[PDB]
Amino acid sequence: GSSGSSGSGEKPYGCNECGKTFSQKSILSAHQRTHTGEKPSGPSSG
Numbered sequence: 001g002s003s004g005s006s007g008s009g010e011k012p013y014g015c016n017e018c019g020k021t022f023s024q025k026s027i028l029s030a031h032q033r034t035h036t037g038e039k040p041s042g043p044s045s046g
């Protein structure tokens, strides 16, 4: 049947880090670059 969960193919990428989506990685990767080094704003936990 499905033999693979593939939607339309608009935003196959996602920044789990925050929970966003992107059309292509090239764009996401960069968006994740800023994410790096997540400092504890409130609750000190990883």
Ligand SMILES: [Zn+2]
Pocket (backbone or CB within 6 Å): 015, 017, 018, 019, 020, 031, 032, 035
């Ligand atoms: Zn993100």
